Ligand binder design. Sequence first.
Ligand SMILES: Nc1ncnc2c1ncn2[C@@H]1O[C@H](COP(=O)(O)OS(=O)(=O)O)[C@@H](O)[C@H]1O
Ligand SMILES: Nc1ncnc2c1ncn2[C@@H]1O[C@H](COP(=O)(O)OS(=O)(=O)O)[C@@H](O)[C@H]1O
Ligand SMILES: [Ca+2]
Ligand SMILES: [Ca+2]
Ligand SMILES: [Ca+2]
Ligand SMILES: [Ca+2]
Ligand SMILES: [Ca+2]
Ligand SMILES: [Ca+2]
Ligand SMILES: [Mg+2]
Ligand SMILES: [Mg+2]
Ligand code: NA
Ligand code: NA
Ligand code: NA
Ligand code: NA
Ligand code: NA
Ligand code: NA
Ligand code: NA
Ligand code: NA
Ligand code: NA
Ligand code: NA
Ligand code: NA
Ligand code: NA
Lengths: 510, 510
Amino acid sequence: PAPHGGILQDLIARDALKKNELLSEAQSSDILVWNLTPRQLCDIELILNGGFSPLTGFLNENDYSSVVTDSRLADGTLWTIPITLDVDEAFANQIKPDTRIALFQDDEIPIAILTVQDVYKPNKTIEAERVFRGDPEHPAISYLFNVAGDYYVGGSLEAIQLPQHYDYPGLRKTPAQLRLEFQSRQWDRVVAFQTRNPMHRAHRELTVRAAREANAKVLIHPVVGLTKPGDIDHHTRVRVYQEIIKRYPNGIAFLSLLPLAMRMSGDREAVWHAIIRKNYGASHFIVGRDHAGPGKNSKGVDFYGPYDAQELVESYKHELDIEVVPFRMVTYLPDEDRYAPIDQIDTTKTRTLNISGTELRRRLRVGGEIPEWFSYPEVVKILRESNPPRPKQGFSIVLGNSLTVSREQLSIALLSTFLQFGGGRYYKIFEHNNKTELLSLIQDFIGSGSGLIIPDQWEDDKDSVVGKQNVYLLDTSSSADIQLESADEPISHIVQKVVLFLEDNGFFVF
Amino acid sequence: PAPHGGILQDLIARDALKKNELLSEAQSSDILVWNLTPRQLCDIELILNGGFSPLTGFLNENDYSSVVTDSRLADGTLWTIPITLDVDEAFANQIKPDTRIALFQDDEIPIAILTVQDVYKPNKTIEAERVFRGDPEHPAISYLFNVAGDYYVGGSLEAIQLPQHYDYPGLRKTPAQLRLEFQSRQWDRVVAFQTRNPMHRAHRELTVRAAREANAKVLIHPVVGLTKPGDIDHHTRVRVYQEIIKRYPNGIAFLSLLPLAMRMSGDREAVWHAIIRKNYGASHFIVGRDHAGPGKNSKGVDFYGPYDAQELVESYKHELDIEVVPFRMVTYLPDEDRYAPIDQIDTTKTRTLNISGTELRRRLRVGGEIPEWFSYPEVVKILRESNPPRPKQGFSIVLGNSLTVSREQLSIALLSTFLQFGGGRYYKIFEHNNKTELLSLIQDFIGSGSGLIIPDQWEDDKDSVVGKQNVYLLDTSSSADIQLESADEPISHIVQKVVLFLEDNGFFVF
Ligand SMILES: Nc1ncnc2c1ncn2[C@@H]1O[C@H](COP(=O)(O)OS(=O)(=O)O)[C@@H](O)[C@H]1O
Ligand SMILES: Nc1ncnc2c1ncn2[C@@H]1O[C@H](COP(=O)(O)OS(=O)(=O)O)[C@@H](O)[C@H]1O
Ligand SMILES: [Ca+2]
Ligand SMILES: [Ca+2]
Ligand SMILES: [Ca+2]
Ligand SMILES: [Ca+2]
Ligand SMILES: [Ca+2]
Ligand SMILES: [Ca+2]
Ligand SMILES: [Mg+2]
Ligand SMILES: [Mg+2]
Ligand code: NA
Ligand code: NA
Ligand code: NA
Ligand code: NA
Ligand code: NA
Ligand code: NA
Ligand code: NA
Ligand code: NA
Ligand code: NA
Ligand code: NA
Ligand code: NA
Ligand code: NA
């Protein structure tokens, strides 16, 4: 289908002959420079390659507000997610319209030249409410208030080069490249499958059903740009995708990585995803249950209805110009050993089975055995390997402040005690001295599977520098993960409590 | 590197706007039509896509003879293998120079329009001797005298479309497409690996060593056009390649299928292969032991020296314009568990191991266990699956002419006897009635693993219609595979001889 807006805005192609010139300007000592934030690197790449057609830069206030309140660009073009260049007051103050800014990656690789149209201060509360539904726990809202700059810079782009990537060079196909891929294969019907999670059996069946329904080839188009916090890293997922793609009949599916930065904006994002997939050459786009939805908030309430996305996409059906293949909950049928859309069964006459993502991590963290019917063996192997069970996970024991015993001797005791257990885990007494360059290394070790014994707490002003993952506090306080009887409890006693606690949480298995 | 001759002769690209016109001419009732033979379909595809640059058609007598006696085109361009359009006297007589012939595939798909330059009758004996070294058992020579037409038609081509293929649509990359593939990946150094056999551990090591020596990425460029008779079909090999490619580090190798029709012309072919890979975008080409060699003849003598190809390629080194990575016998080192070029070991100080292709089939046909060191498990699995052991192979028992007993009763006896053995094999009394439409089906069944009991022989004039594979003759004659005592030997006796013969040859296992 024709790219959204009618013209694929591949600016790399467009500006080719200005490459050298733009590059010179980008590195001229006079031009103002802004180093792109991670999400911005994702967005900038989708803008320059045509993935965000008709966009050709970051939204000015006129187009931005029109998207917030109208799900459309100022000219009426259907567009639900605002793509803006967020900066800080300090930087915002150095620019005026007509100004040319050089956009860099890692304060080293010049990506593009942005010609300023305007500099405004968005009302983040409206964007949060109208665009992401207002809930403060929503991933896009939390980003908007805690990471995003408070000033947006609307302006047009001139491409120097797409952001740099050293992993999967062959797989990050651009819209132009994907289209050629499909053509060389004479693929004129292609249903695209969005995803940010590893694909299990349900998904494989879902995608094949779609290929059959639409009479089209399958395009696995996963997001490797930025997804929901806590998601499985993309490297692991790519390994999973490349593995599961082999379960499809020969020459029916194609894999391509999408460097998109999701907002987990349920229904709006679904519309957005469809527009993006259309730009990339897809003729069909799948939209299953809770598409692009971030689940429930701490109160247990849904951020979106399980089918809001489908409803929203349905209402823009006649102007999306890409056919949507909707799916209802796809579940497992024990008694028949096969999956099927929930909308064509039940009646109690048939029993179903479903292993939610939650329950999935549990087995992964507890060494549980994931059902042969749920996912392929090769896939679980890859997953377990990236997210090992507790007995192979790292951790830290922080000797609380209330501790009255010798921190030095208690540290040694714990070290010697853990050492006798064996199991391949590496241990270390870790003195941070409140130095962030040491604090920031704590999760690195934990990530490496090592066990750390930290004799002292770090000042509260630095608590943010350390990831709380698998970090336990040994203290007399009520907020201690491992609570002590008294501040001067004898070491052997404290040691037994720490050992049994870790044993109870699966870190040790005898 | 620059395509051989300086210009990539991608005629599909060149003639694009003449597509409709040429197609109309190709289907005009007045034009003369020739249906391309299989090998011609392979050649025609390599000429039209630029793989045979500078060629732009089938060699006229001038260029043809220059290649036979000079390993060069008339203009001096280095070219060792003659690419000609062979036809029969009947067809040759209907054409004169300046004539335009329509070249079809399956007497249905118009491939191109050939403009006649000349029609000559080559001296096949010279071509056989100067180009293929003369031995009558040489694959290219046997084809030249038993399959090829006795008349060649030199002339230029105008492409309508490359030959049709419904398998591996994405993998049969054209020179232009491969070059783009490499570029999108920023691959400026690529060492290509030719092959017509499944890749085992030795090859994987060989190719990686090459990647490391040349400091280049790996291109697995296997032949799926036409190879040595008796080779493993390409479908199986592709499955093997796709499987083994996964044993390479991520993003170091690329797979592309080459629809080439080999001539098994050792050294000359090596030169030719190098030219071909250069046209396809490779910067390096591997040339190991007995490259493109058909082994030995029935007398046990080599068609080519194990390193003739390397020597020939070496002598054209300065004009091939593509770097050749030569390899000496790569063998296995038990004591060190690793492979290595034979030129850098031996001295008896180290023991080697080598499982020749011969010995390889033996295990495959005998259910033997192929060593973990020799090939990957996943690969052998695929191989055994395509070339099952005797206990899963089909066969036929032909009741010889000398048979005096009731052919009807002996047939039933054999059927009832084989049936009691079980093992998944399907049996059938097969009456051919000397009808070729029935005879041509015999190998189909054997190929399907079934066991056939044929009560009568077929006239000698039709013996050619039947593949002799796993077809045994039960007769009193000395040329009988299963020799009987007397023409009227009692059935139960004949039955025991047949059963024990099949049991001795592994078809039955109890
Ligand atoms: N059980 C299911 N039934 C129907 N659709 C599903 C199911 N599981 C996942 N999907 C669909 O698969 C696509 C991607 O799934 P996920 O990676 O889990 O999440 S999403 O954030 O990319 O939407 C979405 O269209 C989603 O709705
Ligand atoms: N043991 C080996 N040592 C060195 N080179 C080898 C070895 N085996 C195969 N090769 C090389 O691998 C390439 C393809 O091998 P084959 O498929 O067996 O045959 S070929 O007809 O295509 O050459 C050739 O360059 C060949 O010489
Ligand atoms: Ca703020
Ligand atoms: Ca719910
Ligand atoms: Ca006390
Ligand atoms: Ca003849
Ligand atoms: Ca020899
Ligand atoms: Ca007798
Ligand atoms: Mg990039
Ligand atoms: Mg083809
Ligand atoms: Na369209
Ligand atoms: Na730097
Ligand atoms: Na449809
Ligand atoms: Na709803
Ligand atoms: Na439309
Ligand atoms: Na507990
Ligand atoms: Na026909
Ligand atoms: Na002679
Ligand atoms: Na070199
Ligand atoms: Na020789
Ligand atoms: Na050169
Ligand atoms: Na024997």
